[PDB]
Structure 1
């Protein structure tokens, strides 16, 4: 097995994703070895997803010959599930990312959003607390919990957060459709 292939696979397993803008050489090594990486990850019940438009290589749980797996009972999964509040915040972040991406052209940039901008939009849904400090602490806690899943980054000195591109594959229209159907079933009974 080539050294580059093994190093790229190990790094991707360690971090969960590979981005060309950060690790271009590893991205090139892994992109040209789709069959090799697939063969390596087949015994481990894992699969590789490629987005050359966004230059992202991610690892997902391989779908076996089982009708229902819940995608969280896999032994190597350590993340916790997502509740409704986190899902709503992720949907808001995805809308903001869509807005950022639509008016985007050639060049390198990042999706940065301030907390104060997100404050009223989430206040519309959750409600309003007595003090601004309480709402700010709630937002900080939610952002920290979501950063524990690798979706955002730590807050900067100017009260901003950066949205990772993986949400695009997290909020793909298929998963959005499944979540919408589940929510419709939950509300209606």
Structure 2
């Protein structure tokens, strides 16, 4: 009935959230599709305060916190991204 996001883009976004990154080395089909539709993925992630940073040289995409531009908070805090200390 109503419009649905393209199946491949949905798969790429779900994979990117699950594993936290894509790579042309081991997932070319999704990685290329994401680069061919950056405005769709960035629109999908913006409501959650997530945003993809892309490293074309090394063939990599990774999620990162999209929080405000240096607000009064000097360090970011995000509900979903639980921080760790190895």
TM over 0.5: yes
Q: 1:149-188 deviations in whole A, cap 9, x for unaligned?
A: xxxxxxxxxxxxxxxxxxxxxxxxxxxxxxxxxxxxxxxx
Instruction: Give the match's secondary structure for 1:13.
Output: helix
Q: Mark the runs of 5 or more structure 2 residues left unpaired by the alignment.
A: none
Q: Which runs of 4+ in 1 moved over 6 A?
A: none
Report how many aligned residue pairs link the two structures: 81
| Residue 26 (1) aligns with residue 5 (2) | no
Name the counterpart of 2:17: 13
- Cα pair distance change 1:27/1:50, threshold 3 Å: same
Larger relative contact order (Cα-Cα within 8 Å, sequence gap ≥ 6) = 2
Q: How far has the Cα of 1:78 moved from its partner?
A: 1.9
| CA pair 57-70 structure 1, distance change in 2 beyond 3 A | same
Query: Could you tell me which residue of structure 2 aligns to residue 74 of structure 1?
Result: 78
More helix by percentage: 1
Q: Is structure 2 residue 1 aligned with structure 1 residue 35?
A: no
Aligned ranges 1:33-112 → 2 under 5 Å: 33-64=37-68, 66-68=71-73, 70-71=75-76, 73-81=77-85
TM-score, structure 1 length as denominator?
0.41
* Structure having the larger proportion of residues in strand: 2
More moved, 39-48 vs 57-66: 57-66
CA RMSD, aligned part only? 1.4
TM-score (norm 2): 0.85
Larger Rg: 1
